[PDB]
Amino acid sequence: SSQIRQNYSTEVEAAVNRLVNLYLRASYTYLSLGFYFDRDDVALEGVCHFFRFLAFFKFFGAFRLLKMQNQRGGRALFQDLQKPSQDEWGTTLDAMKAAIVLEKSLNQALLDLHALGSAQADPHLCDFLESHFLDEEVKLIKKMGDHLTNIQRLVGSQAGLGEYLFERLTLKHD
Amino acid sequence: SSQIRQNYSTEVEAAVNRLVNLYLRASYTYLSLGFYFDRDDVALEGVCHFFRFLAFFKFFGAFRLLKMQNQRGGRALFQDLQKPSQDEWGTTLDAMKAAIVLEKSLNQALLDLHALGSAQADPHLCDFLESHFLDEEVKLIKKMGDHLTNIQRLVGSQAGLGEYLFERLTLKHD
Amino acid sequence: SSQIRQNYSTEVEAAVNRLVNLYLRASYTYLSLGFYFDRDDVALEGVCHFFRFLAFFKFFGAFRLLKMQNQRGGRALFQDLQKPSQDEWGTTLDAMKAAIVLEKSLNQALLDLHALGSAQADPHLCDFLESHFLDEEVKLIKKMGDHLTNIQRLVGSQAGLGEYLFERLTLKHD
Amino acid sequence: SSQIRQNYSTEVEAAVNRLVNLYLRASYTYLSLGFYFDRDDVALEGVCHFFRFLAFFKFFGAFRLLKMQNQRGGRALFQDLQKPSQDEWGTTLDAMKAAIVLEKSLNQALLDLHALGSAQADPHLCDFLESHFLDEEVKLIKKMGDHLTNIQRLVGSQAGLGEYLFERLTLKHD
Amino acid sequence: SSQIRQNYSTEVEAAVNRLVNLYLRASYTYLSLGFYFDRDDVALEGVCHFFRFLAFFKFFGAFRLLKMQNQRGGRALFQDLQKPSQDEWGTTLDAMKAAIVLEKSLNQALLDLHALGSAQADPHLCDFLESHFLDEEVKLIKKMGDHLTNIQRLVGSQAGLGEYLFERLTLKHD
Amino acid sequence: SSQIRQNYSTEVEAAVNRLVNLYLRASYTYLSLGFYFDRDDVALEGVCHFFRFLAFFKFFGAFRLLKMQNQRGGRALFQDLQKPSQDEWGTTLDAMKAAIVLEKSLNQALLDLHALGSAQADPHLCDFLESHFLDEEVKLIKKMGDHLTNIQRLVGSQAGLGEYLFERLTLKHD
Ligand SMILES: [Cl-]
Ligand SMILES: [Cl-]
Ligand SMILES: [Cl-]
Ligand SMILES: [Cl-]
Ligand SMILES: [Cl-]
Ligand SMILES: [Cl-]
């Protein structure tokens, strides 16, 4: 058995491995979103950069979980990674709606793992999620919600104009 | 005969001279585009500067070809340079469409010369085009395509508004 | 159809998408290798850092391919990503042998794509692979081969001693 | 009609467009002169650099005229550009004689345009030529004349020696 | 067999070893040229330094080939090195003519190896020659041709005078 | 005859030319040793760098002799250079033993030339060897002897371990 493992349930160990798969799935979804908005026939650089950054950020979340798994003496186990849900992502509005759906799913997975940890009396797990994941997720979802509202107010009856303006004047670009 | 020339066909030498004429023609087209957008009755500074820069960039391509001609021991031969295809260039959209047509023609000329070089077993010629021309051309055409998509999304039903916004918020100006 | 695409076959476009999948598979394999050597019951930091860096490097290769796909006017298409071939990776020797097998497979995929590009008279594709992939791969495989030889000479009859010494004195660590 | 144009005759507008053609012709002549002296079988670097600089300087003159055309509310119109008068330019002496002939022709065109402007009571045109063209031209022709005299004194009965010495000791080179 | 070797023919491996011998032969020829022009009864320092630098440059070419041989998993094999073709090298003109003959022979060997690589579908080999050898060779041969033309124009009927002047005013010396 | 030569025998002149051949032979031997230890199946970087440096150092010795030949008014004469004695160099121990054999042969050649110079009452020759060659050779042979002793003490019954340790902990590497 493990020489370091202490107060670390098999249930938590397995749930952490599943959460890693979810975050890597999310990372891959954002990679696809980024390259869609980089297409010459889409060409919204600020949108591309927004999702490319999220791809890296979700990968970092997976990395932290994996590090924690080893710190606790669990065994990182990797599974197949499903492709993203779409090949083409429509408008900025469509994409930001898909992103907030994705983030809510990751948030619920975080809350579910926190509840498991609490049931298992695993305070290191609970604190780890609180300190590195829960607030970052709330902050990101608030940001997406802010963006959705601004995108929606810009649709009006000149959708193209508003999509350009949002990309130019809210999102970070060269 | 030439004291330095080696593995340099007459076919390649002649094709290089024709390519120089094509690039100088392109340079002159961009000079005309630039001065059109500088007119007081057109007055799109970012568009003017975009095409003025391309005039210089295409001249630089011609210059590099001429330098290479001499490095290989061929003889630079200059022909008459035809004037651009238009005197007035319409909207930014019209102009960017003409530019991408022009660039595709230069790209095809590059690919044709590369194929001639390959047929003639002239690896210095092939590498020269690969290293200094092919990727620069792909990059430029991608940029133009990005611009066309952004211009097209801004037309809407307020063409003037969108043409101003594109010039202000995408193209580089004072 | 595409407004920028020129001299870019459907065969190459599809092969690039498959190559992206191969590089992301390789990246994921290296992520798993890295976290195995980070285990408290394996604990070879220099080996962990070697494979973690390769995970990032292979991801970067996939990223460059995807960027190129868009520059040429092809469509990035993502498929499911299979999990790595093993859950536990044995000794440093075992792992470095698996790594060189993996790299040879990526190298053969590169050479196959280069041959397709050459058959299709696609010099931009050929140059792209030459300039950004082929030499990096040769260099990496040479490095792995150097490492294998040093690992093999250290096995002797005190395998543990040699595995520690290699990690301490050849691989980069804190 | 034009919203800015004032005191700008059609005669001057047309003459400015013709002068642009003359300066671009001169620029192209100097480009050809430069590349001739860059040939491996000519190989006079200081002579190459002298004419390359003049190619740029004459292009700059054309550019200033075009800018002025727009500032006055005239319409820049570009015509075909004839190739230079020669494909091969003989000795430095031959080339410098051709250059001074060329410059005298540009100078006479300047003086003719100034006279037209004066007849048309167009003081902005007259001042523009005085301030940016007439003295630069006098200065250049004086310099060429200085060079011709030095070249002629070096011919003697060892033409090759003198042509080398002039290039080395008067003209600017690496 | 080799643990790293992939897509590297025996034909290419052998041809690389022969090319190393050719470059080391060339290096030795330049060493001899340099020391001839350092003789008190020849005493042309700029000529000495020109050929001494080429001795080092050709050695560097051999070194790069040898490094590449190992990177590909071939076996560097060294053969006897023949002495240079002459013990005394005549005038600067004689020497520069011998040098351009030598360089054309190295260039043809490069082109022959590139053709072998292409026949063998060895793109790493082809790119290696393109990126590190072909253009450097074209550049050097152009430089030599420039020098030959300047030497030839200085012969006149005062050969000694012209040989001194060329060494003083074109070649780099203290 | 020579305008500078004084007190410089034909015997010394010829012996200097032979010594140059010996040092260039030694340089080539070290080049081969270096590239052997750079092989992926040998892979001892510190050993590679040790012999690569000696290749350069022996070349420098040959260069100094050639310079001296000219300073004295003798004629540098180059002969064919035989290939090294081996294609593969065995262990570090084997290689260092071959190196000390080589160095002892160069040292004896130095001492023989010094004795010839002394017999010929050629104090400039004697001082030249004393000041630039004899002590450098003694120092190098002492260093090699130190290395041999350390290599021999590390063989024990785990030859691979000791060869790695010597390369890592005594020889200079990245
Ligand atoms: Cl799926
Ligand atoms: Cl026309
Ligand atoms: Cl699988
Ligand atoms: Cl004409
Ligand atoms: Cl021989
Ligand atoms: Cl032998």
DSSP notation for chain D = --SS--S--HHHHHHHHHHHHHHHHHHHHHHHHHHHHTSTTT--HHHHHHHHHHHHHHHHHHHHHHHHHHHHT-------BPPPS-S---SHHHHHHHHHHHHHHHHHHHHHHHHHHHHTT-HHHHHHHIIIIIHHHHHHHHHHHHHHHHHHHTTTT-HHHHHHHHHHHTS---
Closest-approaching ligand to the CA atom of D83: 4
- How many whole angstroms from E81 Cα to the centroid of ligand 6? 10
Q: Are B138 and B65 in contact (CB under 8 A)?
A: no
Q: What are phi and psi for residue A152, nearest 5 degrees?
A: -65, -40
Give the pair of three-digit tokens for residue E163.
Answer: 């040989």
State in Å: Cα E63 to ligand 5 middle. Answer: 22
Whether C134 and E123 lie within 8 Å, measured CB to CB: yes
Q: Nearest-CA neighbor of A165 among B142, B150, B148?
A: B150
F147 vs F157: CA distance, rounded Å: 19
- DSSP output for chain E: --SS--S--HHHHHHHHHHHHHHHHHHHHHHHHHHHHTSTTT--HHHHHHHHHHHHHHHHHHHHHHHHHHHHT-------BPPPS-S---SHHHHHHHHHHHHHHHHHHHHHHHHHHHHTT-HHHHHHHIIIIIHHHHHHHHHHHHHHHHHHHTTTT-HHHHHHHHHHHTS---
Give me C129's structure tokens. Answer: 């692979």
| DSSP secondary structure code for residue F4 in this structure | S
- Give the long-range contacts of residues C52-56, CB within 8 A, separation 24 or more: C54/C30, C54/C99, C54/C140, C55/C27, C55/C28, C55/C30, C55/C31, C56/C27
Cα E126 to Cα E107: distance, rounded to the nearest angstrom: 14
Let me know how long chain B is.
174
Kindly state the helix (H) or strand (E) to which residue A146 belongs, with its residue range.
helix A135-153
Whether B52 and B30 have beta carbons less than 8 Å apart is answered as yes
Chain F environment of E39 (Cβ under 8 Å) = 70, 75
Distance (Å) of CA A65 to CA A15, A60, C55, E81: 11, 9, 17, 62
d(CA A160, CA A168): 12
Give this entry's resolution in angstroms: 1.5
Q: A156 to chain B, minimum CA–CA distance in Å?
A: 12
Do residue A40 and residue B161 have CB atoms under 8 angstroms apart? no
DSSP state letters, F95-112: HHHHHHHHHHHHHHHHHH
**Cα-trace Rg, chain F:** 18
User: Residue F117: which residues within 8 A CB-CB, separation 6 or more?
Assistant: F12, F123, F125, F126, F129
Cβ count within 10 A of residue A96: 23
CA pair distance D78, B82, nearest whole angstrom: 10
- For residue B67, the number of C-alpha atoms closer than 13 Å in the C-beta half-sphere is 14
Query: To the nearest whole angstrom, how far is the Cα of A90 from the nearest Cα of chain C?
Result: 14
Considering every ligand atom shown, identify the ligand nearest to the alpha carbon of residue E81 and give its number.
Answer: 5
- Counting one residue from chain B and one from chain E, the pairs whose CB atoms sit within 8 A come to 45
| Disruptive mutation site among B142, B150, B151, B161 for chain A (greatest number of A CBs within 10 Å) | B150
Q: In whole angstroms, give the CA distance from residue D101 to residue D89.
A: 14
Interface probe with B: pick from C4, C12, C125, C127, most Cβ of B within 10 Å: C4
Residues 6 or more apart in contact with residue F60 via CB below 8 angstroms: none
Return residues with CB closer than 5 A to ligand 2 (ion). B 82
Using a threshold of 3 CB pairs under 8 A, tell whether chains C and A touch.
yes
In C, minimum Cα distance to B131 occurs at C127
For residue B137, give how far its alpha carbon lies from the nearest alpha carbon of chain C (Å).
10
* Residue appearing with tokens 């031209």: D137
- Smallest Cβ distance to D164: which of E145, E154, E158? E154
- Report phi then psi at D10, rounded to 5: -65, -35
Q: Distance between CA D48 and CA D28 in Å, rounded?
A: 14
- DSSP H helices in F38-158: 45-72, 92-119, 123-129, 135-153
What is the 8-class DSSP label of residue A82?
Answer: P
**Rounded Cα gap, residues B140 and E8, in angstroms:** 36
Residues of C in contact with B126 (CB under 8 A): 123
CB contact (8 A) between residue F81 and residue E28: yes
- What angle, 0 to 180 degrees and rounded to 10, lies between the N-to-C axes of helices E45-72 and E159-169? 60
Query: What is the rounded distance in angstroms from the CA atom of residue C46 to the CA atom of residue C42?
Result: 12
**C20, A28 contact by CB (below 8 A):** no
CB E96 within 8 A of CB E154: no
Query: What is the SS3 assignment for F81?
Result: strand
> Is B29 exposed, middle or buried, given 0-12, 13-18 or 19+ CB atoms closer than 10 A?
buried
Instruction: Say which residues have a Cβ less than 8 Å from residue E137's Cβ, sequence separation at least 6.
Output: E103, E106, E107, E110
Measured on CA atoms in the order E52, E58, E61, E65, is the torsion positive or negative?
negative
Distance, CA of D125 to CA of D134 (rounded, Å): 12
Here the tokens at position D11 are 């005669």
For chain B, list the contacting chains (3+ Cβ pairs, <8 Å).
A, C, D, E
Nearest ligand to the CA of E78 is 6
Kindly give the distance from the C-alpha atom of residue D77 to the centroid of ligand 4, in angstroms, as a whole number.
Answer: 19
Mutate to test the interface with E, among F18, F48, F75, F88 (most CBs of E within 10 A): F75
The reply to whether residue E2 touches residue F87, judged by beta carbons under 8 angstroms, is no
> Three-state secondary structure along E56-86?
HHHHHHHHHHHHHHHHHCCCCCCCCECCCCC
Segment (H or E) for C132: none
Q: How close is the nearest chain F Cα to the Cα of C30, in Å? A: 22
Chains B and E touch (3+ CB pairs under 8 A): yes
CA-to-CA distance for C52 and A76, rounded, in angstroms?
A: 15
**Under an 8 A CB cutoff, do F38 and E81 touch?**
no
Burial pattern F138-153, b for ≥16 Cβ within 10 A else e, equals eebbeebeebbeebee
Taking an 8 Å cut-off on Cβ atoms, the answer to whether B161 and A161 are in contact is yes
**From the CA atom positions of chain D, what is the Rg in Å?**
18
Nearby residues of B120 by Cβ (< 8 Å), 6 or more positions away: B9, B11, B12
Is E161 close to D165, i.e. CB distance below 8 A? no
> What element of type H or E holds C115?
helix C92-119
| β-pair partners for D81 | B81
| Chain E environment of D43 (Cβ under 8 Å) | 145-147, 149-150
Is the distance from CB of C173 to CB of C46 less than 8 angstroms?
A: yes
Q: In terms of Cα–Cα distance, which of D65, A151, A78, F136 is closest to C55?
A: A78
Measured in Å, residue F83 CA sits from the centre of ligand 6 at 5
Ligand closest to the CA atom of residue E28:
5
- Asked if the Cβ–Cβ distance from B35 to D77 is below 8 Å, we say no
Query: What phi and psi values does residue C81 have, to the nearest 5 degrees?
Result: -110, 115
Coil vs helix vs strand at A135: helix
Residues 6+ apart with CB under 8 A from E134: B123, B124, B127, E110, E111, E114
Q: Are C143 and C171 in contact (CB under 8 A)?
A: no
Which two three-digit tokens encode residue E116? 């072998």
Method by which the coordinates were obtained: X-ray
Tokens of D93: 């002496």
| Residue whose structure tokens are 């345009």 | D113
CB within 8 Å: C83 and A84: no
Q: Determine the straight-line distance between the first and last CA of chain D, rounded to whole angstroms.
A: 53
Which tokens hold the place of A113? 């793992």
B-C Cβ pairs (cutoff 8 Å, strict): 45
* Residue A164: both structure tokens together: 């350009």
Mutation to test the B interface, candidates D5, D25, D37, D38, most B Cβ within 10 Å = D38
Beta bridge partners of B81: D81
Angle at E119 between CA E117 and CA E121, to 5 degrees: 65
Distance between Cα C17 and ligand 3 center (Å): 18
